[PDB]
Amino acid sequence: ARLGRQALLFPLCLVLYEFSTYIGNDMIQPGMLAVVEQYQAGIDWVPTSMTAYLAGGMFLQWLLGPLSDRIGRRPVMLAGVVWFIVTCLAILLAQNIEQFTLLRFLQGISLCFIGAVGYAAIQESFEEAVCIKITALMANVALIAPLLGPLVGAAWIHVLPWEGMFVLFAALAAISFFGLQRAMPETATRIGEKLSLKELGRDYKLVLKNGRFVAGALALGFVSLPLLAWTAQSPIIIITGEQLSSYEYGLLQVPIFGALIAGNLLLARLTSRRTVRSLIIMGGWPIMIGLLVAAAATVISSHAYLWMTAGLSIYAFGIGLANAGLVRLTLFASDMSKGTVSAAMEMLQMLIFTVGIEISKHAWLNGGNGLFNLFNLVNGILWLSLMVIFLK
Numbered sequence: 001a002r003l004g005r006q007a008l009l010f011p012l013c014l015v016l017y018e019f020s021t022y023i024g025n026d027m028i029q030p031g032m033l034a035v036v037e038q039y040q041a042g043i044d045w046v047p048t049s050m051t052a053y054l055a056g057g058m059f060l061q062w063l064l065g066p067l068s069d070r071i072g073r074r075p076v077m078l079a080g081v082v083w084f085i086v087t088c089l090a091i092l093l094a095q096n097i098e099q100f101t102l103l104r105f106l107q108g109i110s111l112c113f114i115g116a117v118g119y120a121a122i123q124e125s126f127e128e129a130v131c132i133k134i135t136a137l138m139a140n141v142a143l144i145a146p147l148l149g150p151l152v153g154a155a156w157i158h159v160l161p162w163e164g165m166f167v168l169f170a171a172l173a174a175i176s177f178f179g180l181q182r183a184m185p186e187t188a189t190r191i192g193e194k195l196s197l198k199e200l201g202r203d204y205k206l207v208l209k210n211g212r213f214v215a216g217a218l219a220l221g222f223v224s225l226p227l228l229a230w231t232a233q234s235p236i237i238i239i240t241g242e243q244l245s246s247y248e249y250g251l252l253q254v255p256i257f258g259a260l261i262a263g264n265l266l267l268a269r270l271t272s273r274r275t276v277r278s279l280i281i282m283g284g285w286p287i288m289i290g291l292l293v294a295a296a297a298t299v300i301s302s303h304a305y306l307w308m309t310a311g312l313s314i315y316a317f318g319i320g321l322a323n324a325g326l327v328r329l330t331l332f333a334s335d336m337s338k339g340t341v342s343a344a345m346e347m348l349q350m351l352i353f354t355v356g357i358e359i360s361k362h363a364w365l366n367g368g369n370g371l372f373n374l375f376n377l378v379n380g381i382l383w384l385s386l387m388v389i390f391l392k
């Protein structure tokens with residue numbers, strides 16, 4: 001009725017779509033420089049790829065979850081994977097940057113599907129301990145894809161063009177898609193229910209008014225932004241800005257990332273020894289020194305990219321520790337539905353990220369490299385403020 005040990009070929013179809021989606025950001029960003037030095041506009045449009053790719057996610061975010069309830073889980077999930085493979089290749093026929101966004105944004109809306117419909121079909125079919133192994137894997141995906149995507153994204157620009165990636169994914173999404181064609185047993189018990197959408201944001205306005213949740217979502221939104229600012233701009237920061245090569249550049253991704261995960265290995269090993277509340281304040285020191293250090297560094301010295309990247313590691317480590325923990329408490333900051341609390345915190349996080357990245361954009365151009373790190377501190381500051389309230 002629920003689980004066994006034989007239909008494990010289906011979750012890997014979901015986990016593979018999860019994989020191919022993140023790298024859709026975590027490889028293209030370095031290679032966007034080649035996409036920028038071809039479409040003709042400027043290096044300012046490098047990060048602005050990630051941005052439109054994000055802003056898509058939070059679009060149907062809130063709708064697809066209840067929508068996948070009203071009209072099945074199988075067809076909603078399929079329409080998404082199709083939509084992805086479709087847009088993964090139809091992008092190679094745009095050939096201009098004012099409408100490079102358009103399709104980048106369309107692949108962006110193909111992100112809610114993984115959580116809104118996909119993740120639910122595991123909290124509906126498979127049992128507790130069965131799901132636990134599945135999710136801790138899904139956890140690793142969203143950390144390895146950004147960790148090891150940029151390395152393959154740095155070789156792939158040296159050994160191939162940028163067009164090679166867009167196919168490779170539509171392939172990797174169809175790899176699991178033809179694995180999902182006849183192996184996706186839906187679990188939606190709301191078929192034959194009204195198209196109630198004009199009063200759907202009512203179940204949303206309840207969490208949207210929670211003086212504790214909102215703060216805790218923004219505590220989360222901001223705290224992590226600096227990470228994705230780098231992820232968005234490190235191509236330019238380094239290859240152009242600092243004047244470096246794809247080895248000396250792709251070198252700098254890992255120390256950040258390797259420390260990030262060092263924050264997860266220890267988190268998993270001290271979730272036992274220590275309480276949740278403690279862990280966030282326990283991770284709220286390395287960060288606070290990271291975004292201290294990153295900027296304290298680019299004060300008089302404007303080009304010391306080593307110690308900035310070294311800042312974003314102290315920075316990086318603590319994020320492993322904090323974020324995750326704080327996620328728990330932001331969910332249970334509201335005594336409501338998992339899905340809607342989730343729908344909110346995500347439809348917030350991105351606003352923070354999408355916009356966050358744009359404000360981080362000009363910050364670099366105009367201000368140089370200094371301002372950038374200060375508009376990193378801000379959010380350290382920002383986050384920390386939210387904490388002085390949150391726990392006490």
Ligand SMILES: C[C@H](CCC(=O)O)[C@H]1CC[C@H]2[C@@H]3CC[C@@H]4C[C@H](O)CC[C@]4(C)[C@H]3C[C@H](O)[C@]12C
Nearest residue numbers: 115119135138139142143224227319320323346
């Ligand atoms: C919204 C899903 C929920 C599905 C799941 O539980 O796996 C979660 C799970 C993994 C999460 C991502 C992990 C990688 C990133 C870690 C950063 O420190 C914060 C932003 C990112 C980009 C996270 C954003 C978001 O919070 C995700 C995508």
